């Protein structure tokens, strides 16, 4: 449920990075 997460964990080193990276899906 978390596929953006798990892609972002294998090009970063931080999962609250990932996690504010996912946070927003629509670009503003």
């Known amino acids: 449920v978390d596929a953006?997460?798990?892609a972002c964990?294998?090009?970063h080193?931080?999962?609250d990075?990932?996690?504010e990276a996912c946070?927003?899906?629509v670009p503003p």
């Open 17 to 19: 990075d990932c996690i």
């Open 23 to 25: 946070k927003n899906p």
């Open 4 to 6: 953006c997460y798990e």
């Open 9 to 11: 964990m294998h090009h």
């Open 13 to 15: 080193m931080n999962s």
